[PDB]
């Protein structure tokens, strides 16, 4: 969502989200850093292509056409620069000309030594406490978006982690049509579609950046969390990692974990879906957490086997129509779990990906929620290995990847909503150690 810098009148009255770098001559001089070679302020590419019929309500939703109900004029930046201002690298580079190679490794958890684990939660929970020093946060549609006045930007600073909760809410959260009108729900910008691996790819990318920049530690990486073991129970779910099972609440996170001081954002759906509001940064009730808690669907009451893993990755079609959560024969929606491993769809079968979520039976078991559990992280770090395991091994095959005709929000060439700068799901179908700047120590079956 959108630097600080944009979030104003002027930027938002003449759709240019282009801010200066370095403005030494005065403001306005610098845009997207013109005067270093870094790059320029230009018109936005969005996607124009068409979506499938599933959403019917083209013109009412800010998400369509992303980002062109806010924006149309954005920074692109020449080479390897990056940045909202082209102030910054693309992933994978470093130095003030982004010409010095980073390669960084995401390890399992469970792989970490006493004190790099002690140093990752602590890096969490700076997260979750830490003010976004860039992106501010919508609390009203872009009707309303200026205030009443129309002179008062309806954002609100956010925490680093509570941002990556945010844009999973705001790709997710239904379309608004009217009070007293039900809100429209058959529409997903980051899940039951083609765009999932990327758009969490990038979900996982941004966060590590903005981690990396609060910790300014360069070679942070995020760890995964190996749901492929057929555990009965949550093996990172101890007071070292993640927390353990509260003793007096069993639905709570243990008091000796520092999760089970954090406080959710975006669990007010009626409110967002009445009113026409969008989830802020008002935290309110704690994390749920119940592994193999749910008695009543046994199927998620274990995690993934191994073997899952194994059957997902032979699946050799990145995607097939109709691109969504009923697409057979495609990894996408197999690894995503609403396929089971072979391939084959069932809309009884949770596998994979939904069901390490629905394992968890609470907070990160709810699509508009499940990021304020922080297993979330190491739940998609270890889902992005495997797709770029797959990635590596069908030679990034972007073709089954369609131009048109996916859900609104999937089409390769959307930008993935609500990222900003621009980013299209082609940028992320790529092998992360050559073209993202990290990589993943990770062994598979056979
Ligand atoms: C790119 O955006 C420009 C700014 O529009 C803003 O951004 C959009 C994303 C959207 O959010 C919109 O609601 C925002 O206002 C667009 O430039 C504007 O274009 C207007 C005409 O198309 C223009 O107007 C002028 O002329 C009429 C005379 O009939 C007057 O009524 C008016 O007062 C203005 O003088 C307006 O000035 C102009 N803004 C500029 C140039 O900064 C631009 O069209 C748009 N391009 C696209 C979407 O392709
Ligand atoms: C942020 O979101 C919360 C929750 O959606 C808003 O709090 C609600 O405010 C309305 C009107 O005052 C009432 O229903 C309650 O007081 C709140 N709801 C709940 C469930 O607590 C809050 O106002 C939002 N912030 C802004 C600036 O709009
Ligand atoms: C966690 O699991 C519990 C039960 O195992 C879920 O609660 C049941 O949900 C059904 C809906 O299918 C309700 O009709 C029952 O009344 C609930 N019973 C109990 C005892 O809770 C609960 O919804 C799950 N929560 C999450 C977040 O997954
Ligand atoms: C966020 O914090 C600034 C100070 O950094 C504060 O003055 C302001 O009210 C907030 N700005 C926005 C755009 O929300
Ligand atoms: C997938 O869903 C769409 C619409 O819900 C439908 O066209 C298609 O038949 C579904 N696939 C099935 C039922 O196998
Ligand atoms: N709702 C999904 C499971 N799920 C839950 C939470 C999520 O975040 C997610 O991405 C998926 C399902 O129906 O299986
Ligand atoms: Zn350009
Ligand atoms: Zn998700
Ligand atoms: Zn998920």
């Given at each position: 969502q959108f630097p600080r810098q944009c979030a104003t009148v002027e930027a938002l009255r003449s759709g240019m989200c282009c801010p200066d770098l370095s403005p030494v001559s005065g403001p306005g001089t610098d845009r997207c850093g013109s005067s270093s070679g870094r790059g320029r302020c230009e018109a936005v590419t969005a996607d124009s292509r068409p979506h499938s019929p599933q959403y019917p309500h083209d013109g009412r939703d800010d998400r369509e056409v992303w980002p062109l109900r806010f924006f149309n004029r954005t920074c692109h930046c020449n080479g390897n620069f990056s940045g909202h201002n082209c102030g910054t690298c693309r992933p994978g580079w470093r130095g003030a000309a982004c010409d010095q190679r980073v390669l960084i490794v995401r390890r399992n958890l469970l792989d970490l030594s006493k004190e790099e684990k002690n140093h990752f939660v602590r890096a969490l929970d700076m997260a979750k406490r830490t003010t976004h020093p860039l992106f501010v946060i919508a609390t009203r549609r872009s009707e309303e978006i200026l205030g009443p006045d129309g002179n008062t930007p309806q954002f609100e600073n956010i925490s680093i982690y509570n941002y990556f909760v945010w844009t999973h809410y705001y790709s997710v959260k239904k379309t608004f049509l009217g009070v007293g009108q039900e809100s429209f729900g058959e529409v997903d910008f980051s899940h039951e579609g083609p765009a999932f691996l990327t758009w969490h790819r990038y979900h996982l990318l941004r966060l590590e950046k903005d981690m990396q920049e609060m910790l300014q530690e360069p070679s942070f990486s995020l760890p995964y969390w190996?749901?492929?073991?057929?555990?009965?129970?949550?093996?990172?779910?101890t007071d070292d990692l993640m927390g353990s099972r509260s003793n007096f609440d069993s639905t709570l996170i243990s008091p000796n974990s520092v999760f089970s001081q954090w406080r959710v954002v975006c669990d007010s759906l009626e409110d967002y879906d009445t009113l026409g509001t969008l989830c802020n940064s008002t935290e309110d009730g704690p994390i749920r957490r119940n592994p193999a808690?749910?008695?009543?669907?046994?199927?998620?009451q274990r995690l993934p086997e191994p073997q899952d893993v194994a059957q997902c990755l032979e699946?050799?079609?990145f995607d097939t129509p109709?691109?969504?959560?009923?697409?057979?024969?495609?990894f996408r929606n197999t690894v995503e779990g609403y396929s089971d491993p072979t391939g084959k769809y069932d809309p009884a079968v949770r596998s994979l990906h939904n069901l390490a979520h629905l394992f968890l039976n609470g907070t990160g078991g709810q699509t508009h929620l499940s990021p304020n559990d922080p297993i979330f992280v190491l739940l998609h770090t270890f889902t992005d290995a495997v797709f770029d395991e797959w990635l590596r091994r069908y030679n990034a095959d972007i073709s089954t990847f369609p131009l048109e005709n996916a859900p609104i929000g999937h089409n390769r060439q959307y930008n993935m909503v609500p990222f900003w700068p621009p980013v299209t799901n082609t940028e992320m179908f790529?092998?992360?150690?050559?073209?993202?700047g990290y990589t993943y120590e990770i062994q598979w079956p056979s």
């Open positions: 190996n749901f492929a073991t057929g555990k009965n129970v949550c093996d990172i779910c808690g749910n008695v009543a669907r046994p199927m998620v699946v050799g079609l109709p691109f969504y959560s009923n697409s057979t024969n495609s790529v092998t992360a150690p050559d073209n993202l």
